[PDB]
Write a protein that binds this ligand. Structure first.
Ligand SMILES: [Zn+2]
Lengths: 118, 154, 215, 128, 60, 84, 101
RNA sequence: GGUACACGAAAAACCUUACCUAGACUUGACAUCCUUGGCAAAGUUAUGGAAACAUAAUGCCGAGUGACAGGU
RNA sequence: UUGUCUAGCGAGACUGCUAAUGCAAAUUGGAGGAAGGAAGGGAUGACGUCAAAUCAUCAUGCCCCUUAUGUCUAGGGCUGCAAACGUGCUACAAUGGCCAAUACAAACAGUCGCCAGCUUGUAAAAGUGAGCAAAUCUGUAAAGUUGGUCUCAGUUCGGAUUGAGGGCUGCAAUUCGUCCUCAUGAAGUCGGAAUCACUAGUAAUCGCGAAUCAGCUAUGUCGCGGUGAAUACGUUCUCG
């Protein structure tokens, strides 16, 4: 479950690359295991790699986040819900304006000639 | 149309004693922040002092003298495909353009840090490389090529 | 598109018309809407009273409505039949706990007060009188009253359609742009059977030099 | 023999004092070293640049208490206070202090943000 | 729908949130100033008439 | 979330739902309250939630609880954009 | 005595109208009462209102008023109850409002 | 178009709101005049309703009448 | 380690004096002075053009409706969406990101409010709770300085979108509140034709206050202060 932690950079960021561990809880793990921040990933003792892996197993599995999010979306969609209906057609959900803006989810662009003004 | 306007007076820099240094410190300025540009310029001067051991004033004056343009191209259109007319440029505008070119070609290069990039810019300008001497020579070549237009012009 | 002349020189050469104060933003709105009912009530009910202006004096449940008119008899009535009615009407429109004790005072040289002149112009216009002769007569009487030049302009239906045919007159030094001029202003809305007629009268009452501040 | 002064650059009033002392001048701003109070730049020399054209810190104590302003406005205020103090010290300094135009209260103060203008001078934009 | 809205404001609402502000001289319910209980244009014309005791013109 | 007694019911539909649950669960009941949240007791019956024009039937399921009862009712129809 | 430190603070919306009143007060109390230090100016707590001109959009042309509020400060070292008895007749106008202690 | 487009709106989840659906009212939610009077008027509590509401009691205001009130 | 300070009055600045040239207004220079030749700024906006905008601030003639185009309530909508334009914010980064320590403002506002201090809380906040009807009490200034780290990469830049958990107002937060914490991290590497604002404490930039308001992705508007530029040879071209 050790997935491509890059070298020539600190461990604090090395734990930010696995899917589900950002800046904050990586620092929480860092302070929990007594690993010293400022150690670059290279020249790191194995003695504490097992500690990192144990405390991460205490957390949520990094590969399990995708499955949990998909299961939650399916749970929200299988029941008749406006949000599920909104989320199904790739249109923003939290209530952002859709008049002109909010194109980060609707796709790059699809231009159509407007009204033929006279 | 308007009339001639006054020009303000710049105080000498009270550590290195040079007004051209003040013009540098004001042209490299952004966000209106002297405490940052001053650190940039004085660290660049320290770098000049360290490598290629030489008084920073001498390098500055050599680079500025080598960069000042002899002629200036000013656009004067008569019809389509407008032609240009070389014009003589005053010494105050000469140093203005020279320092503008130094700063603006300094803030575009490799050697990421602003300190080292501007230090390399000024060193290259002193050593007459293609950093800004090339552009000065290109706009100088653009002059005296249309000199037939320059002789009969307004 | 010019500012009202009465509001421009207000507070620097002319005193406030309603001098009072109260607790901050609590019920000053209530007093502001209640006392103004007296100001509008006079000008609506008593056209012929020729009231020029009224001053409001409120402090902690007391009110003094100063009145300036040319013909106080209409306000007083016959053997004081109307003063009691007007004071009880003011009481009913203001409340019960406030002592009122109003006064009625004469105005010196009324024919140089813009408010009553505009009121007379509105009365003449609504009385089907032709505008030109009535306006000229009022101009003559106000000039003979012993004041400076006048600026009367009247818009509205001048006995027909195409209303944008307003008429204006100027007969003397009337420096609107001068703060130190002591210019009095008023407006009246003549209501003719064909539409709305707006009359505006500017009156100069001499310069106000060496007055220091508001009188 | 204490001497007074007053500078008011950029809505920042500065009270200064002068006294001959055996030391080099004992620079002091608000009972603390100006080398740390002000940002150590040309600005800490802009206060003594009046002294440049005269007897620079011959024997003159610096006791200044200031209010308001940022740090450069403080420098201008204390500069004008110092120049006023020295022109009080010797009426013959009028000729050379006025030559550099170091007195006279440059009075350049921020404007009033006019309505419809972002910064009292700039309109938002123009479009047709 | 102006007189009904004007009289409704005086009537106490069934919830406190339902209460809103509105000027006393005119039925406009927008741009009212709580410090004077009066809309922007009425306040303008009243200050021009001088009814408000504290009024001047600006220099700031 | 209200963060304190967060689960909120309009307090006039609780009586109806309790009575229906205790009275053989008559299938159709008409409510116009979208503000109510469904309690765990809400499961079992149906509602004619008001979308704005008509009464659309919805069948609660223990599959879901706490979703805003009105969230089950769509309010605005589709764009189906006209070409021009 | 029996009422030391009579701190009377007054504010209004005009300068001259308040200056006249404070001069009248400081002169009328200048009888049997003694040691009345002069009026104390105060920052003139001020508020500025901005109102657009036209009933229609016109947003680029708006004027603005400003309801001024001046402020002075009197303090009395000793009440000297005869002095306050004479002080009952100051009869301040409506513009000036006094906040006692 | 310049002179509209972070504008009217210095605050649209309910009210605001002027729109639609539905539930209700008809000298009307508010106003003057006429006659005839003085004991009610705002709020509260169950009860049906989702709420206006119709009930029952608690704690300047009624009744009849037509010109009319009313219209963002 | 006291005469700043706020606010009343007054003085000062008026081509006042001199040199030049002009009949005379007047222009330039110089002395003195804080300001020199309308000292910077504002309010102050003529006759009239656009049959310019507003019957939806208000008033109003006429027309129209009236057991309805009037009134109350519940729910929805002004926030939609294949699209286009305008105005702003965020950015695209080492003139920087993050962390720690740390110094300097004016103005404005507040007894249903400002909320100090203390306790709890990864935080939004909650509880306790003085003080203030205010030059008294409250609204930690940020840019700025130093130290440590990052080493030019779609990254410790950029945060959108999305999932979950909390806290606040409000009867009520799904249609449609914002705040905090955790989770992922879109596009973007300075931008085509063409255009915009700006002549000093201005542009740029960093924060602070107020209105409406129970609360509100106001990044809006109205104000305040800190740092703080570059240029104007000139009217040949361009607009009015
Ligand atoms: Zn109004």
């Amino acid at each position: 479950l050790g997935i491509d932690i890059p070298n020539q950079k600190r461990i604090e960021i090395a734990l930010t690359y696995i899917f589900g561990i950002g800046l904050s809880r990586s620092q929480a793990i860092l302070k929990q295991a007594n690993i010293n921040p400022d150690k670059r990933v290279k020249d790191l003792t194995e003695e504490e790699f097992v500690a990192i892996r144990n405390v991460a197993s205490a957390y949520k599995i990094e590969g399990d986040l995708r499955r949990e999010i998909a299961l939650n979306i399916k749970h929200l969609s299988e029941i008749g819900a406006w949000r599920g209906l909104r989320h199904r057609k790739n249109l923003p959900v939290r209530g952002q304006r859709t008049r002109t803006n909010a194109r980060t989810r609707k796709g790059p662009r699809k231009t159509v000639a407007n009204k033929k003004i006279e | 149309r308007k009339n001639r306007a006054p020009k303000r007076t710049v105080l000498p820099d009270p550590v290195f004693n040079n007004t051209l240094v003040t013009r540098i410190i004001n042209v490299i300025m952004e966000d209106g922040k002297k405490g940052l540009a001053q650190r940039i310029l004085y660290g660049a001067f320290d770098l000049i002092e360290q490598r290629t051991k030489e008084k920073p004033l001498t390098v500055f004056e050599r680079a500025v003298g080598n960069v000042m343009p002899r002629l200036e191209l000013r656009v004067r259109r008569i019809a389509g495909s407008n032609y240009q007319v070389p014009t003589e440029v005053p010494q105050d505008r000469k140093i203005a353009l020279a320092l503008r070119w130094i700063a603006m070609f300094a803030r575009k290069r490799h050697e990421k840090t602003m300190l080292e990039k501007i230090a390399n810019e000024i060193i290259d300008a002193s050593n007459n490389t293609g950093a800004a001497i090339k552009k000065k020579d290109d706009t100088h070549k653009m002059a005296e090529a249309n000199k037939a237009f320059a002789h009969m012009r307004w | 598109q010019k500012v009202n002349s009465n509001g421009l020189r207000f507070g620097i050469n002319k005193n406030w018309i309603s001098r009072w104060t109260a607790n901050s933003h609590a019920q000053t709105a209530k007093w502001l809407i209640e006392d103004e009912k007296i100001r509008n009530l006079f000008f609506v009910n008593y056209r012929n009273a020729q009231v020029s202006n009224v001053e409001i004096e409120r402090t902690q449940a007391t009110v003094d409505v100063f009145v300036y008119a040319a013909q106080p008899a209409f306000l007083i009535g016959s053997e004081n039949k109307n003063i009691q009615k007007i004071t009880k009407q003011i009481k009913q429109i203001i409340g019960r706990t406030t002592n009122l004790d109003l006064t009625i005072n004469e105005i010196g040289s009324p024919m140089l007060s813009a408010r009553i002149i505009a009121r007379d112009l509105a009365n003449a216009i609504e009385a089907r009188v032709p505008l030109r002769t009535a306006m000229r007569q009022s101009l003559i009487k106000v000039l003979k009253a012993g004041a400076n030049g006048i600026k009367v302009l009247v818009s509205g239906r001048l006995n027909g359609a195409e209303i944008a045919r307003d008429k204006m007159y100027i007969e003397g030094n009337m420096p609107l742009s001068t703060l130190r001029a002591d210019i009095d202003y008023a407006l009246e809305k003549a209501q003719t059977t064909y539409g709305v007629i707006g009359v505006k009268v500017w009156i100069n009452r001499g310069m106000i030099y060496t007055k220091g501040l508001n009188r | 023999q204490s001497y007074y002064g007053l500078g008011r650059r950029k809505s920042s009033s500065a009270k200064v004092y002068l006294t001959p002392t055996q030391d080099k001048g004992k620079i002091t701003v608000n009972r603390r070293d100006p080398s740390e109070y002000f940002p150590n730049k040309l600005v800490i020399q802009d206060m003594e640049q009046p002294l440049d054209l005269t007897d620079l810190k011959k024997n003159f104590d610096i006791n200044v208490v200031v209010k308001g302003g940022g740090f450069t406005g403080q420098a201008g205020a204390i500069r004008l206070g110092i120049v006023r103090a020295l022109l009080q010290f010797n009426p013959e300094l009028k000729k050379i202090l006025k030559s550099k135009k170091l007195t006279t209260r440059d009075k350049r103060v921020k404007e009033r943000k006019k309505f419809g203008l972002y910064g009292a001078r700039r309109a938002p934009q123009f479009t047709k | 729908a102006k007189k009904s809205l004007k009289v409704k404001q005086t009537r106490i609402p069934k919830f406190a949130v339902r209460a809103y502000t509105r000027c006393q001289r005119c039925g406009r319910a927008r741009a009212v100033l709580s410090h004077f209980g009066v809309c922007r244009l009425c306040f303008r014309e009243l200050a021009y008439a001088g009814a408000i005791p504290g009024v001047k013109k600006a220099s700031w | 979330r209200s963060a304190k007694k967060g689960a909120f019911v309009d307090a006039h539909l609780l009586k109806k739902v309790i009575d229906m649950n205790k009275q053989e669960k008559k299938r159709p009941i008409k409510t116009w309250s979208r503000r109510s949240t469904i309690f765990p007791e809400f499961v079992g019956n149906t509602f004619a939630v008001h979308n704005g024009k008509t009464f659309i039937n919805v069948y609660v399921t223990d599959d879901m609880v706490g979703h805003k009862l009105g969230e089950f009712s769509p309010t605005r129809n589709f764009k189906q954009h006209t070409a021009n | 005595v029996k009422y030391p430190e009579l701190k009377i603070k007054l504010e209004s919306y005009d300068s001259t109208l308040l200056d006249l009143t404070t001069k009248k007060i400081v002169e009328v109390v200048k009888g049997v009462d003694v040691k009345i230090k002069g009026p104390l100016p105060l920052p003139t707590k001020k508020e500025v209102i901005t109102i657009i001109r036209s009933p229609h959009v016109d947003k680029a042309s708006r004027e603005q008023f400003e309801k001024n509020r001046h402020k002075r400060l009197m303090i009395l070292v000793d009440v000297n109850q005869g002095a306050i008895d004479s002080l009952k007749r100051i009869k301040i106008p409506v513009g000036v409002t006094l906040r006692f202690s």
